[PDB]
């Protein structure tokens, strides 16, 4: 998960790199690539939050037991 | 001035909240305690609106939602976004049935000990991206599988007019092959459901709560 | 009708200059996506390279070799290479310099 | 920073250590997980704000110095983004020894 | 370059009929969406679109065979023509076979039973007679597997095809889009009885989109008073006049007589065009 968060913010600039390259209209492929990148970033953030919550709950239950 | 702005807010709500469950429980100079859902408790305020009045109007109308109310998960997004209060009321009235349906879904799992050893491996929790969509994912750590159901607000052209309908569908990642161990239930849902265009299901909010239970009937 | 001819010639020169610009930029600052983003975005705005700020420091070996005024003489093959390229490139005090060779006016790159 | 949990120690030894000391490390890890949970949401909020700023780049711009100010602001924004990424990396590596017992417990229980 | 705004409405049109295919399958009993039957039933329209697709292939083949080489900067219009066809949400080749198969099936049915009213029904009535109720079911079933299988089902349903200016309700302003006087008083109305804000030709219609080149109308073209209105269908067009420099390939003061000069006096519906009063 440590590498995923780094690459995702590196890739959102990488995905845009070709977007401003043509800028340097918009292609639908690049737009949908950006959309899926941002939605997967949100999804992995949610997954990491759920994993943290589950690990925490395991922490209290093992400490109690 | 406080009373005049409160009366204006009440009139606007009556114009925008024409429903049989709309009622005001407690009236306070600094907060509003009114009920618009089907909660049975008399003194439980479904929605709390704090009154911050200025020399001419209310500075900000912060929407607060009770923990018992299933709508409390959208509280931070309402707090951090300065959207129109009328638009917030419209969204609340448009999504109240969805909130009730998801309340039933979460209370199904949240029931106390029923003297049954049916320790289901699937847990239901709400995923949130923004105010435009609400996502439900089913966590199964025992089977290591995921069941994602995304509900977005997508506009569709209807008779020369654009309307917003709930887009309940499986995500594009859910290109699940026949080889998945958990694939049977997704395939059953697809066969028995997939306005259906094969992937998406756009529905009228007045009819989302029965059809979602029809989806949830397979789930339960 | 020399006006349209010179406009189209300037446009072709501009597009080839931009081509050389990004092909050189993608390799000089490959290690810093932030620097590449901000540099290309500022040049889309039309900011001179002498005003914008850099977060990272480039090595001095490329600076010494690109000019050759140091102890090591520039290669004659390198001289031919920099002659055939359309852009005069050099770095002064951790910052490169970019100047148009045909139009000396303030060529606005804004969109 | 401080390595409360030594590296390479077994799960049972960690249980014995945790059973004593009146749970100062339990308090510390509870505070750490609480601040991680309270940090998760603001990152999403500010990331959505950055997306909104990027999408609305063609509005409220009329002077060149306005572009200077706005793009300096956004470069600063991603500056604290990388700083926050480093801080959360430090937070997770601080809890890395604590999480290291979970794979061993799962594989032993398998 | 000037053909590009027209092509946008050309693609925007074929998507509307494809969108109605998905809607009609779920509810075949909806009478309010019977227009989709007549459009495919028209016999020359299927050939007409095929001819349009034929010349489109010929133009692209000729442009590929004979590209512009002297000035690379001028290749943008030629390149954009190739891009807009490839980037269309639905492939033209798949849609080309769609109408071709309909023609063959609708010809063998004529030999099965001789009838001449069906030719009128598919062209004007836009309906299928009850005696041919079995024929209507064929359109619903076959259209799903033919072309939609090669396109994005989710995208076309939510695609923004609004503003096609097909219905009359979106031509005239909603203030006047109703009967104003009883039938006893007659059908012709004197101007003095119109509402004060609705007593000019400027407030009669939606002055947002163009009708000949299918291009968006800017504020400059609205306010210059050089646009024309059709007295028959209510259409508004700035045809027959020199276009502004911002609409050209490169901003310049050179005046070029563009194809809109064909409709200087006659509208698209054979109506007369007149200078719109300011």
mmCIF file of C-alpha atoms in Angstrom, chain D residues 46-85:
data_model
loop_
_atom_site.group_PDB
_atom_site.id
_atom_site.type_symbol
_atom_site.label_atom_id
_atom_site.label_comp_id
_atom_site.label_asym_id
_atom_site.label_seq_id
_atom_site.Cartn_x
_atom_site.Cartn_y
_atom_site.Cartn_z
ATOM 1 C CA UNK D 46 -8.387 18.515 0.090
ATOM 2 C CA UNK D 47 -7.768 16.130 -2.822
ATOM 3 C CA UNK D 48 -11.304 16.811 -4.056
ATOM 4 C CA UNK D 49 -10.599 20.524 -3.594
ATOM 5 C CA UNK D 50 -7.463 20.167 -5.740
ATOM 6 C CA UNK D 51 -9.486 18.382 -8.430
ATOM 7 C CA UNK D 52 -12.056 21.194 -8.342
ATOM 8 C CA UNK D 53 -9.285 23.796 -8.669
ATOM 9 C CA UNK D 54 -7.764 21.944 -11.628
ATOM 10 C CA UNK D 55 -11.135 21.601 -13.373
ATOM 11 C CA UNK D 56 -11.945 25.309 -12.899
ATOM 12 C CA UNK D 57 -8.597 26.559 -14.241
ATOM 13 C CA UNK D 58 -10.378 28.394 -17.094
ATOM 14 C CA UNK D 59 -12.319 30.641 -14.687
ATOM 15 C CA UNK D 60 -11.517 33.662 -12.504
ATOM 16 C CA UNK D 61 -8.339 34.393 -14.450
ATOM 17 C CA UNK D 62 -7.666 37.765 -16.079
ATOM 18 C CA UNK D 63 -4.171 38.924 -15.012
ATOM 19 C CA UNK D 64 -0.834 37.180 -15.450
ATOM 20 C CA UNK D 65 0.133 37.752 -11.812
ATOM 21 C CA UNK D 66 -3.116 35.958 -10.966
ATOM 22 C CA UNK D 67 -1.607 32.915 -12.673
ATOM 23 C CA UNK D 68 1.607 33.441 -10.694
ATOM 24 C CA UNK D 69 -0.329 33.464 -7.416
ATOM 25 C CA UNK D 70 -2.638 30.558 -8.270
ATOM 26 C CA UNK D 71 0.079 28.237 -9.553
ATOM 27 C CA UNK D 72 2.414 29.072 -6.671
ATOM 28 C CA UNK D 73 -0.528 28.172 -4.426
ATOM 29 C CA UNK D 74 -1.055 24.833 -6.174
ATOM 30 C CA UNK D 75 2.662 23.995 -6.112
ATOM 31 C CA UNK D 76 2.568 24.669 -2.372
ATOM 32 C CA UNK D 77 -0.529 22.444 -2.171
ATOM 33 C CA UNK D 78 1.268 19.446 -3.663
ATOM 34 C CA UNK D 79 4.191 20.411 -1.404
ATOM 35 C CA UNK D 80 2.148 19.689 1.703
ATOM 36 C CA UNK D 81 0.731 16.683 -0.167
ATOM 37 C CA UNK D 82 4.194 15.128 -0.371
ATOM 38 C CA UNK D 83 4.870 16.208 3.220
ATOM 39 C CA UNK D 84 1.663 14.487 4.362
ATOM 40 C CA UNK D 85 2.603 11.395 2.358
#
